[PDB]
Amino acid sequence: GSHMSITPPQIVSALRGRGWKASIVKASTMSSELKRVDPQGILKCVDGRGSDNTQFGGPKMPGGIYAIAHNRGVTTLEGLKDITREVASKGHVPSVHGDHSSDMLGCGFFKLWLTGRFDDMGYPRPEFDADQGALAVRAAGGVIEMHHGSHEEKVVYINLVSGMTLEPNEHDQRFIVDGWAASKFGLDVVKFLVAAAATVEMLGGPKKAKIVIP
């Protein structure tokens, strides 16, 4: 698809400029945690909470496949179904998620998007609600995952190691953003990463990041 027009040191610079604490960490220091992506795993949200997921090992993007629609300015249910099928055809099981406290509005990213919190960054709002979106993804062969508990993330990992990912730990949470996946889907990587950063910020998450590189 597209390529990383931005380097790791710059990502760190951009984040710090947004008021973040950021540093670069080598993949070799996480040999124990970095997992090769499993094609049977759902491409899911960066959310650090536990859930009822049984399809582990998939890439992590804000709102699951919503990160792709959001980055591309795709705002219709038909377009979302197209993306769902596209993701399935590209090696991952597509998904979106809700939670127990707010049901389908349980994904903070989609709620931020639907409510216009990305208005100032110039993003077109979706033209469907969280219930409509979830059911469209399901009807197109995707998965609706359900999270539980409170957001207790302590750090954000921005993984740039292609084909690998990190998994949720509900008792020692972290946001995980597979930046390499944005390139795989031809997304504007810089916008994707800035949106992921804004998401953590607006969800009142920790503005501390570790950028993982080969």
Binding site for Zn(2+), by residue number, is 45, 97, 107
For the CB of residue 201, give the shortest distance to Zn ion in the complex, in Å: 15
Among positions 53-112, residues that touch Zn ion (CB under 5 A) are 107, 109
Stretch that binds Cl ion, among 36-44, 46-54, 161-169, 170-178 (CB under 5 A): 46-54
Give the integer Cα–Cα distance in Å for 36 and 33: 10
Specify the residue, 45 or 136, whose C-beta has the smaller distance to Zn ion. 45
Which amino acid is present at 17? G
* Closest to 5 in 3D by CA, of 191, 165, 150, 177: 191
Q: Is position 130 an interface residue for Zn ion (rule: CB under 5 A)? A: no
Which residue in 47, 99, 153, 178 binds Zn ion (CB under 5 A)?
47
Q: Is position 45 an interface residue for Zn ion (rule: CB under 5 A)? A: yes
DSSP character string of 100-144: TTTBGGG-HHHHHHHTTTTGGGTPPPPSS-HHHHHHHHHHTT-EE
Specify the residue, 37 or 130, whose C-beta has the smaller distance to Zn ion. 130
Q: Is position 176 an interface residue for Zn ion (rule: CB under 5 A)? A: no
DSSP designation for 41: S
- 162 near 153, Cβ under 8 Å? no
- Beta strand pairing status for 93-99 and 42-43? parallel
Q: Is position 8 an interface residue for Cl ion (rule: CB under 5 A)? A: no
Stretch that binds Cl ion, among 1-9, 35-43, 101-109, 113-121 (CB under 5 A): 101-109
Residues that bind Zn ion in the complex, under the rule CB under 5 A? 45, 47, 107, 109
